[PDB]
Amino acid sequence: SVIAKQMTYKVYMSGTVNGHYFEVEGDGKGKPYEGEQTVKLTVTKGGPLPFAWDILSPQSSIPFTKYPEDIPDYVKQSFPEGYTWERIMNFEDGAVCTVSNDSSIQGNCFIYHVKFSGLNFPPNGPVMQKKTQGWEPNTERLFARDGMLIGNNFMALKLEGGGHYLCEFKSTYKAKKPVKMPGYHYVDRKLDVTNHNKDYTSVEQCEISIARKSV
Amino acid sequence: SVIAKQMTYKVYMSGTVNGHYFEVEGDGKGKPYEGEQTVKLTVTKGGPLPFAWDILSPQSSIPFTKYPEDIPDYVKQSFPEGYTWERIMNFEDGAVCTVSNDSSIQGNCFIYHVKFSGLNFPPNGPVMQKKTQGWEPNTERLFARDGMLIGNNFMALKLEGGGHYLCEFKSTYKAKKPVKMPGYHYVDRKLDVTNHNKDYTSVEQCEISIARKSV
Ligand SMILES: [Cl-]
Ligand SMILES: [Cl-]
Ligand SMILES: [Cl-]
Ligand SMILES: [Cl-]
Ligand SMILES: [Cl-]
Ligand SMILES: [Cl-]
């Protein structure tokens, strides 16, 4: 396979949030067959960001998902040709983000190019006031349709003071060549910001992702 | 506690689907602390139903959910006063259902009164053409807000021929008196039609529901 037991990745992300332009670059590493990975991000343009970092954390790596042998692994099969993904994030206060990725491979390093567009975040809401405290551990429902893998997730951000701020994800993963399609299944994830500087111009994230066929 | 290790229930359900009125009565039993239950339904008015039975199967019992000791059990705590629930089902082809319940207790028997309103099912879609083949095993995301328990579930019906027909649930459970609120958690369920007659005027269902605090 072109996917080694230890791999690196490079992320080039750019976008807007309520009209504010930014660029981010990241250096990641992980164990694709263990579903373990980490990434170090730097804001390279438009920093310090005037919005919560948490809306960007799920946008910087599906090859690093642990798949049991009896569940086809859509994204690993897509390489070396690679894949793209598209995502809609619908927040409960009306904000909407559209995110797209292109993923390729060069040797032992995946290359991700990400475009992020977020808007209608209320100026006094938790994203513009930076009151979020990370995503709850979560489960993505996945199934195959028309050669694409479609995921849906009822996500939530923890808030300063104890509440939750809800977000619905719809993710569409598109392999660049046909692959063996999986059945109806789930992916459980833990995604955490494990380090950052005062203004989130440098951020470190760790993610564990494990696929399964229902409890 | 007023909830015994073995209990029964009676269901009185009525409603409309694309303007077609019906009534259903059910007799259920289960082990509330094991999350195990079964129910036998009879269509008492408006039968045979011109729509897929599956849209009604999740509307006939939250007391029968296995809760670990370290997760407060919102619905069991609500008794003997009881609780109500409200549900919105949004199907991917535009159909929408609104469902409400009132649940009370009389001795060893819970009493459920259910009102179902479903509409905009396309006449050539899988519900009106009876092409559904049961719900996939699923996971409800649950959290506490304003004294209510709010659940969300990315559900799917299996289809004749191999596809899936998606439905999003939003359920709101409302205890009639204040109870100890749980943290952010999940409930996994298997719900199956285990017997039926030719025209689904008699149906038997079995459900296993188990709460947990993330994999
Ligand atoms: Cl790692
Ligand atoms: Cl497919
Ligand atoms: Cl850092
Ligand atoms: Cl039982
Ligand atoms: Cl609350
Ligand atoms: Cl039967």
Numbering used by the authors:
A (entry chain A), B (entry chain A): 2 to 61, 65 to 219
Sentences from the paper on this structure:
Anthozoan chromoproteins are highly pigmented, diversely coloured and readily produced in recombinant expression systems. Here, high-resolution X-ray crystal structures of four open-source chromoproteins, gfasPurple, amilCP, spisPink and eforRed, are presented. Like GFP, chromoprotein monomers have a β-barrel structure that contains a chromophore, which is autocatalytically constructed from adjacent X–tyrosine–glycine residues encoded within the protein sequence itself.
GfasPurple has only one molecule in the asymmetric unit, but its crystallographic symmetry expansion also revealed a similar tetrameric arrangement of monomers. Previous work has confirmed that S175T and S61C mutations alone are sufficient to shift the colour of gfasPurple to be the same as that of amilCP. Like other characterized chromoproteins, gfasPurple, amilCP and eforRed contain an sp 2-hybridized N-acylimine in the peptide bond preceding the chromophore, while spisPink is unusual and demonstrates a true sp 3-hybridized trans-peptide bond at this position. It was found that point mutations at the chromophore-binding site in gfasPurple that substitute similar amino acids to those in amilCP and spisPink generate similar colours. We found that coloured variants with mutations of residues that face into the β-barrel were much rarer than those on the protein surface, and all but two of these mutated residues (Tyr116 and Ser761) do not interact directly with the chromophore. The Y116H and S61I mutations obtained also changed the colour of gfasPurple to pink and indigo-purple, respectively. Sanger sequencing revealed that one of them was the single Y116H mutant and the other contained Y116H and E73D, confirming that the Y116H substitution is responsible for this colour change. Interestingly, the corresponding position to Tyr116 in gfasPurple is His120 in spisPink, suggesting that chromophore interactions by histidine in this position may be important for pink pigmentation. Finally, we also made single amino-acid substitutions to disrupt salt-bridge formation (E96D, R149H and R149K), anion–π interactions (E140D) and hydrophobic interactions (F158V) at the a/c interface, with the intent to minimize changes to the surface character. These five mutants also produced colourless colonies.
